Amino acid sequence: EFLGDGGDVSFSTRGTQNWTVERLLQAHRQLEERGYVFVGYHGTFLEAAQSIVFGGVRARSQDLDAIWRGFYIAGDPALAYGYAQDQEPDARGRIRNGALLRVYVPRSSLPGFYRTSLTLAAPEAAGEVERLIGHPLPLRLDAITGPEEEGGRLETILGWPLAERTVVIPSAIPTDPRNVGGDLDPSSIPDKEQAISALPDYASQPG
Amino acid sequence: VAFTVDQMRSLMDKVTNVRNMSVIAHVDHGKSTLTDSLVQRAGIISAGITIKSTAISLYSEMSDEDVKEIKQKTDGNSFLINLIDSPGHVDFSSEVTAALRVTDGALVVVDTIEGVCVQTETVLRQALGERIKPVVVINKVDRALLELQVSKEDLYQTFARTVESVNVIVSTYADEVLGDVQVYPARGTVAFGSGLHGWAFTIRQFATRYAKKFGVDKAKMMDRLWGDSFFNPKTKKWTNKDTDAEGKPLERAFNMFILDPIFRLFTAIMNFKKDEIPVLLEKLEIVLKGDEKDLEGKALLKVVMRKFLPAADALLEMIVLHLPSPVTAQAYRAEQLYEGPADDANCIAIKNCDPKADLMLYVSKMVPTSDKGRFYAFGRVFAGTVKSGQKVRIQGPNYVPGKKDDLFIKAIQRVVLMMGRFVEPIDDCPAGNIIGLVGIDQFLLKTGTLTTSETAHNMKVMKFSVSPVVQVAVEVKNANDLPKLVEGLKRLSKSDPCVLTYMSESGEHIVAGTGELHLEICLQDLEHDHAGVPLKISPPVVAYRETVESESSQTALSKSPNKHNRIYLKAEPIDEEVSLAIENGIINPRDDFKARARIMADDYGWDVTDARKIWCFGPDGNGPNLVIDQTKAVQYLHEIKDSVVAAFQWATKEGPIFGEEMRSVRVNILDVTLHADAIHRGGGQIIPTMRRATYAGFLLADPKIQEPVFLVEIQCPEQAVGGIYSVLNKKRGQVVSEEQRPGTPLFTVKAYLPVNESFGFTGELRQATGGQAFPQMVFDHWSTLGSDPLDPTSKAGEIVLAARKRHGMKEEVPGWQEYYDKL
Ligand SMILES: CN(C)CC(=O)Nc1ccc2[nH]c(=O)c3ccccc3c2c1
The missing domain is CATH 3.30.70.240 (Alpha-Beta Plaits)
Known part of the structure; x- marks a missing residue:
């Protein structure tokens, strides 16, 4: 259990139940003590959030012909934030807010995290990513970090194998239930979470 | 007894032999007890749909001799009494008046020791205001003897003062036209007794007994049984002075032939003097039946008194012989109940309780039935006759013969008798009776008038409101029973037309009512019946509304997450008139956009252009807020309409000031830019955008x-x-x-x-x-x-x-x- 202690954790439109900043800090410290490192944020929906934290991230019937298949996350919670919400309406017509997830991988996998300046969709991307990882796409036990799109923020794509080895826990950064669609407000990020959110330094040259 | 539909129907034709009444009494004065006794005695039973007991049918018969003592046209020895239910506490003001407005008589219950309490005093005033004839009963006499051990004369003086207090009210507030309506024991309109033990009597009862032992026409026997009348045991003469020739005192007639017999049985039985009890009993011709013979103490007295003076009959005697029929009363109550011309064709029909005239049926309240979440109308037919299938004009609160507002010309699905908890189908029902209707629920919220005359005004309306202004959040103290709460809330809303249960975006369960008490009651009945599961109720709160005072400072704009769709809009105020118009069905969501537009343009100064472009109302698709499509040449615009509307429903249900409902808010969609491909213009994308733009607009419109x-x-x-x-x-x-x-x-x-x-x-x-x-x-x-x-x-x-x-x-x-x- 990597959730620190203090009562059952659940995800609500109301906010994440039982997850204070303090608890976060304990959880994070203990993940490091077993040799894990934080690699980015992952926003998504409440239902989803629940599955990832209790059951872990798992691919499921991906398009094998889809070469960029993987689990996208982001160093910047703001960019993650955007995906923290239902993607479609419920029968009534409500689009409720979601939750931000913090992604951790076994420290032992860092050898496979690479970075580039090309935008992942660009023609060169494919070849250059492959140059960096040592094999044709899709990514596997490796990850690539690069501009979401020209000038955009940076996203990270852990390959499905690696992603299945992650450990995710809740963030102390809340989504707004009364502003679904707004951009994450920099002041709602707790300072203490900011302290434990540095990213590892990724390699720009192949191994 | 059990009656067939025919018997009932037949009985309902002789209105002169019907009695519509209520029981005015404080609950702590045996109100429920006395009422039961009448049910356990004359309660009418019919020879799978249950309802909320609103009225009980009573049957009673009398001798051709008794029928004569009735100073009001009658016919036959049979009588139908409609006991219409009343509230327990006075705070229920509005529904107290409801019951009263459909009755003609009233059985006022007063207490022996305490007399006329404030509460009862008040309701009696109201009853008098509706021109209800009172008939009194001094209950709890037992408590006088057993406790206070009061003397024959002191108890007499008690009743005297009591009867006096009552009449002080009756004379001060009854209408002069009605004539002297004071209660007089000697005239048989005041009964005395004890609901506990189950006994009660009227001077008229002991007068029919002592009737001949003295050679008297009871008329003068009961006249002597009260006031100052004495019978010297020695002289064996009737005098009008409390003293005989020498100066010795003389026991009043009442104390001599009424209070004495009763006082002994009490003294005998409660002292266990087994030698006297049998002797004393036989003299009053009270025959104990086997098993009762061994009883002693309260147990015994309780049984003796019941055989002796059956409380039920004393009351049923006054009801028939003194309370007005639905014929005598309507003659002087019509004008007061009709809000039209006192000479109008209908008002007349009311007075004459004519079953031939145009219908004039009054709906006093809607009662919950088992048959779905449907409600049956409860009321009285003041004129004409209502019959299954008959199509009627349902005139609501706001109706006025002139306009067509609040009218619903529909057909009466079914006419049923409100036999307490069960209903019994009946073809028709002539003026003068309390009946139930099936199939109005979706036309009448609670009160209303049903007619046939196209020029018929409504009858004294009872202001009620379905506006949730007070609400609370309900939570289960023990999470396990949560589903049991989800059921009762659904159950509660089903029992009352004016309560409301819903879930906020926050996912809370809300209960909203008409007021502090109305909600209060609703909450009790929830934690005790509908859910019976322990709950955490939040403190009361007043429901507010969020609105704008002007047009948005500047154009409001938002874009979807895609960053491919944009919505440009401005918000502006709606005139209270229009909002009211919307709230009062004039401007209707379901109308023909064109007709509706004509109305807004004409009567409300709206550009028929804008009005023709209304996309929806809100919240709940019919609130006093609108979205007007002022865009110009936006390709694919219609493909995002549902989303836009959907969003508007949420935006108006919980505004940006603090989660409250919007009211009188106008949203004009100025421009829209949509991705060429639908994939990217889905609900997930448009709905949040519009919602946000609306908020922006709102916040900018002052x-x-x-x-x-x-x-x-x-x-x-x-x-x-x-x-x-x-x-x-x-x-x-x-x-x-x-x-x-x-x-x-x-x-x-x-x-x-x-x-x-x-x-x-x-x-x-x-x-x-x-x-x-x-x-x-x-x-x-x-x-x-x-x-x-x-x-x-x-x-x-x-x-x-x-x-x-x-x-x-x-x-x-x-x-x-x-x-x-x-x-
Ligand atoms: C098609 N759906 C199963 C989901 C999907 O295609 N993507 C998805 C679903 C959730 C995502 N959450 C993120 O925090 C994130 C951050 C940087 C870049 C992408 C994401 C992100 C992406």
Whole structure:
């Protein structure tokens, strides 16, 4: 259990139940003590959030012909934030807010995290990513970090194998239930979470 | 007894032999007990749909001799009594008047020791205001003997003072036209007894007994049984002085032939003097039946008194012989119940209780049935005859012969008899009876008038309101029973037309009612019946409304997450008139856009152009808010309409000031830019955008909040009217009018009371006006506070801040920038 202690954790439109900043800090410290490192944020929906934290991230019937298949996350919670919400309406017509997830991988996998300046969709991307990882796409036990799109923020794509080895826990950064669609407000990020959110330094040259 | 539909129907044709009444009494004075006794005695039973017991049918027969003592046209020895149910506490003001308005007689129950208590005094006043003939009963006489061990003469003086108190009320508030309506024991309109033990009597009963042992026509036997009349045992003569020739005292007739027999049985039995009991009993011809013979103490007395003086019959005697039939009363009650010309074709038909004239059926209340969440109308046929299938004009509260507003020409699905808990189908029903109708539920909220005459006004309406102005959040204390709460809430809303249960975005379960008490009751019945599961109820709260005062400072704009779709809009105010029009069915969502447009353009000064472009109303698809499509040549526009509307429904249900409903908000969609491919213009994308734009627009259109306000009508003696204005001035109340009832010293003050200031109002008014005041308050209008909801220290901002905190939202109100595009 990597959730620190203090009562059952659940995800609500109301906010994440039982997850204070303090608890976060304990959880994070203990993940490091077993040799894990934080690699980015992952926003998504409440239902989803629940599955990832209790059951872990798992691919499921991906398009094998889809070469960029993987689990996208982001160093910047703001960019993650955007995906923290239902993607479609419920029968009534409500689009409720979601939750931000913090992604951790076994420290032992860092050898496979690479970075580039090309935008992942660009023609060169494919070849250059492959140059960096040592094999044709899709990514596997490796990850690539690069501009979401020209000038955009940076996203990270852990390959499905690696992603299945992650450990995710809740963030102390809340989504707004009364502003679904707004951009994450920099002041709602707790300072203490900011302290434990540095990213590892990724390699720009192949191994 | 059991009757067939025919028997019942046949009985309902002889209106001259029907009695429509209620029982006015404080609950702690055997109200429920006495009533039962009548049911256990003359309760009518029919020879799978259950309802909420609203009226009980009673049958009683009398001798051709008794029928004669009836100073009012009759026919036959059979009688049908309709016992219409009443509330337990007086606070239920509005429904107290409801029951009264459909009755003609009344059985007022007063207590021996305590006499006429304030409460009963008040309801009696109201009854007198509707021209109800009272008939009194002094209950709990037992408590006088067993406890106080009072003497024959002291107990007499008691009743005397009591009967006197009552008549002080009866004469001061009854209408002169009605004539002397005071109660007189010697005239058989005052019974005495004990609901506990189950006994009660009338001078007229002992007078029919002692009737011949003295050679008297009971007329003069009962006349002697009360007041100053003495019978010297020695002289064996009747005198009118409490002393014989020498100066020795003489026992009054009442104490001699009434109170004495009863006083001995009590003294004998309760002292266990087994030698006397048998002797004493045989003299009164009281035959114990085997098993009862061994009884002793209370157990015994209780059985003796029942065989001796059957409480049920004493009451049933007064009801038939003194309470007016649905013929005598309507002649002098019609004018008061018809809000049209006192010479109108119908008003006349009311007076004459003519079953041939155009229908004039009064719906006093809607009662919950088992058959679905449907409700059956309960009322009385004042004129003509109602019959299954007959199509009728259902004239609601706002109807007026002139216009077509609030009218619903439909067909009466089924006519049924309100046999208490069960209903019994009946073809027709002539004027003068209390009947039930099936199939009006979706036309009449609670009260209303049913007619056939196209020129028929409504009958004295009873102001009721379905406006949720008070609500609370319900939670289960023990999470396990949660599903049991989800059921009762659904159950509760099904039992009452005016309660409301729903879920907020926050996922809370809300219960909203007509007022402090109305909700209060609803909550009890939830934690005790509908759910019977322990719950965590939040403190009461007044429902507000979020609105705008002007047009958006500048164009509001937002884009979807895609960053491919944009919505440009502006918000502007809607005129109270229009909003009311929308609230009052004039401007209708379901109308023909063209017809509706014609109306708004014409009667409300709207550009027929804009009105023809209405996309929807809100919330709940029919609220006083609109979205007008003012775009110009936006390809694919219609493909995002449903989303836009959907969003509007959420935007108007919970606004940006502090989660409250929007009211009188106009949203004009100025422009829209849509991705060429549908894939990217889905709901997930448009819905949030519009929602945010709307908020932005809203916040830019000079925000303000509205507070609801009640219209309280108060009945009160000129003497206590003081306390009224007293409390009104400490609640921000606004006096609208104060009048007096011609004859009596009964003022009737009407004022405006801010709902958010009405908490515990009745309680305080109680102390103030010595409890003589009788309130009647209903939702009246929405008032726009002047202060800035955005300024924390202002008055509205104070409301907003607290509310925001309560909901655990960010203490400050989002500026428009949060919803405008983050450019
Ligand atoms: C098609 N759906 C199963 C989901 C999907 O395609 N993507 C998805 C679903 C959730 C995502 N959450 C993120 O925090 C994130 C951050 C940087 C870049 C992408 C994401 C992100 C992406």
